[PDB]
Design a protein around this ligand. Sequence first.
Ligand SMILES: N[C@@H](CCC(=O)O)C(=O)O
Length: 297
Amino acid sequence: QEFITIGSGSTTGVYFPVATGIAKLVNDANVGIRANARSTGGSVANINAINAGEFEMALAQNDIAYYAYQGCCIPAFEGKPVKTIRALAALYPEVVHVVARKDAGIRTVADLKGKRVVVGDVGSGTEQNARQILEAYGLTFDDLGQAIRVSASQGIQLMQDKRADALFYTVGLGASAIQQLALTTPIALVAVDLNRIQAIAKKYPFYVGFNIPGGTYKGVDVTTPTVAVQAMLIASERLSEETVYKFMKAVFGNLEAFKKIHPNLERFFGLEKAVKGLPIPLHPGAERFYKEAGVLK
Ligand SMILES: N[C@@H](CCC(=O)O)C(=O)O
């Protein structure tokens, strides 16, 4: 068998269940691939691991993938393009969640000054968005009381224990980590003003407005106006066309099966959307798949 490891994120985010379900589905297709998901810090770690030859595929944010491919915009990639990544599919929106304890004196992003904040994991996309958003509100990590980098499960535990005041997570709606925190702890979601971000859209062009419906998380009954990017499935350029083509048919050829993997896929995924506005080139095997499917002409 040909072994594929799919980098993901924290076990209580959305990448990890999605990657796990993708891996199972391609294994079940009996196409000579043996796939597994791996938990990681998220997008930056995942791209680095593809480039290093450690992972064959991963989930990543569209913004981070662009920055990697261009060698720009964030410190992790500035100065050295990562041209070894290719797109397979745009998947679903990843929303910037800014979670605050209700007792912490936080109603806006500006209130994070002096607070203990989980800014994202080491190697996360989340941290990059947090840094950009804080600067749009006139803050740096140094203005925080503590800038904490940990996994989603560690981060929610800190907020449960009142060892953190707030937590950022760029993640699909309905992440277990967030759901679990809302069940135990009085929390709110802090708004992120797109227009304040928009002042920085020249530099960071992938933010879109996104409104988290009220009642998504327990006790959070009001809507939350924030911003989103897009989750993507990416792959090494070094994977053969034939391997990627077979993978694509096994995973995306099976649309009902694919959408069962996570509610975000059922809600948001579609084949036409999968190829729209991509930040990096498609893998040849994906191009072939989408051409046959009639999605690319
Ligand atoms: N987009 C997040 C991870 C989201 C998830 O694990 O679902 C990141 O790159 O850090």
